[PDB]
């Protein structure tokens, strides 16, 4: 659980160095994007339910996982999805603010693909839901902010794959 400042400190700190000018380029670089990330995390908090409603209607409530036998049939199973998609849109918001995807694999990615295989959750439909959820998130926060929030979505999709 490190942000961009924590990761910069650490690489300063695991080797025991001080904070040298080249290391600060990302930081003088992280503080520049500090204004963009909060407004990105602002609108995502507002439209959390609307984004997840847009992603599932655009990706998978259109393929027989929604129908009987599919992986999402029963209401408990459907309700687990939007609960499950809420974490991806939420933890991706944390990575967008912290500027470092360490929180994702710390709290989301580890034991995740090993868990979906246990339950039998289709990883293929999961990533396309997150991809569609990434597509709507670029709608709200804009282009570059969508590039930032989108940079952690595919990080989840990559490791979850």
């Amino acid at each position: 659980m490190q942000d961009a400042i924590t990761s910069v400190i650490n690489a300063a700190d695991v080797q025991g160095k001080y904070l040298d000018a080249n290391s600060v380029e990302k930081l003088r670089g992280y503080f520049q994007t500090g204004e963009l990330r909060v407004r990105a995390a602002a609108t995502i908090a507002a439209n959390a339910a609307t984004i997840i409603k847009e992603a599932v209607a655009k990706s998978l409530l259109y393929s027989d996982i929604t129908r009987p036998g599919g992986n999402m049939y029963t209401t408990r199973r459907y309700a687990a999805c939007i609960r499950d998609l809420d974490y991806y849109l939420r933890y991706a918001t944390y990575g967008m603010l912290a500027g470092d995807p360490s929180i994702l694999d710390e709290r989301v990615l580890n034991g995740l693909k090993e868990t979906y295989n246990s339950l039998g959750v289709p990883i293929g439909a999961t990533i396309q839901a997150i991809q569609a959820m990434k597509e709507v998130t670029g709608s709200l926060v804009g282009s570059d902010a969508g590039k930032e929030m989108g940079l952690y979505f595919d990080y989840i999709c990559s490791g979850l794959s």
Partner: protein
């Protein structure tokens, strides 16, 4: 009853762990993990082994798996030992 009554945001009981477990669920995992305490050096309690492997139920695996990472734990392996998959009726 079950943990999905209608609770979500802005509801009277506090926003918390919501598991997709049915009424009296009978599915349980076999998990394995280490979980260093990260609090013994200002509490000075006795030490306990942190590497555990145990059967957690499906009713409360998500809360436990959500909490094991809360305190920096790492999950080495989990399986669904007891229970079916894609089973509409019968998880009870």
């Amino acid at each position: 009853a079950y943990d999905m009554d209608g609770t979500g945001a802005g509801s009277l009981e506090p926003r918390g762990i919501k598991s997709s477990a049915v009424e009296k669920d009978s599915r349980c995992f076999k998990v394995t993990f280490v979980l260093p305490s990260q609090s013994r050096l200002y509490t000075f309690r006795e030490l306990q082994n942190v590497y555990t492997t145990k059967m957690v139920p499906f009713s409360s695996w998500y809360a436990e798996q959500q909490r094991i990472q809360k305190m920096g734990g790492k999950i080495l392996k989990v399986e669904l030992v007891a229970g079916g998959q894609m089973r509409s009726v019968g998880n009870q």
